[PDB]
């Protein structure tokens, strides 16, 4: 675990390198906050996310978003899934861990439908008894193995705020500069 924690800190500095300094700390706040929390009413979460999404989408064009799905089409699971255990260790996830879930294939389906409902419901199901910290380990691992455009960072962060009670959804745009 010496490593898990050391590695996580490295992650945080790269987050700072890639995005805001503000961004990186926001991530930590979220990482911290989740420890222990279980996944609540997935509906309340979707509801809050869909509300933030509309705002975000008014600042980016269709073509802008598509660029994000297209970048994701080139990511292979092995590339980011490699960080899963490390995050699980740092977050102290003690419950069961659905290791073999490839979120990226799920997000890709959204490019065509525009429907986020399925994703949320499956994030709840795969977290199982592990709670909200599984969602963090999962998505942080994704961030760890990619360099996405602001829109994608905003969306991924939006999913995190929506499940992790601090609906600091209104602060995302600020932390990112959009």
Curated annotation (Swiss-Prot):
Q: Where in the cell is it found?
A: Cell membrane
Ranges annotated as spanning the membrane: 127-143, 150-166
What domain of life does the UniProt record list for this protein's source?
Bacteria
Q: What does this protein do?
A: This colicin is a channel-forming colicin. This class of transmembrane toxins depolarize the cytoplasmic membrane, leading to dissipation of cellular energy.
Member of which family? Belongs to the channel forming colicin family.
**Additional note from the record:** Plasmid PAO3 is a small colicin E1 derivative.
Protein name, UniProt field: Colicin-E1
Give me the gene this protein comes from.
cea
In the complete protein, the residues contained here run 345 to 522 of 522
């Amino acid at each position: 675990i010496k490593d898990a924690v050391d590695a996580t800190v490295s992650f945080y500095q790269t987050l700072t390198e890639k995005y805001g300094e503000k961004y990186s700390k926001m991530a930590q706040e979220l990482a911290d906050k989740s420890k222990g929390k279980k996944i609540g009413n997935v509906n309340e979460a979707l509801a809050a996310f869909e509300k933030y999404k509309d705002v975000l989408n008014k600042k980016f064009s269709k073509a802008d978003r598509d660029a994000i799905f297209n970048a994701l089409a080139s990511v292979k699971y092995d590339d980011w899934a490699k960080h899963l255990d490390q995050f699980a260790k740092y977050l102290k996830i003690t419950g069961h861990v659905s290791f073999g879930y490839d979120v990226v294939s799920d997000i890709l389906k959204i490019k065509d439908t525009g429907d986020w409902k399925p994703l949320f419901l499956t994030l709840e199901k795969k977290a199982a008894d592990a709670g909200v910290s599984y969602v963090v380990a999962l998505l942080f691992s994704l961030l760890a193995g990619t360099t996405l455009g602001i829109w994608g960072i905003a969306i991924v962060t939006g999913i995190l705020c929506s499940y992790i009670d601090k609906n600091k959804l209104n602060t995302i745009n600020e932390v990112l500069g959009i």
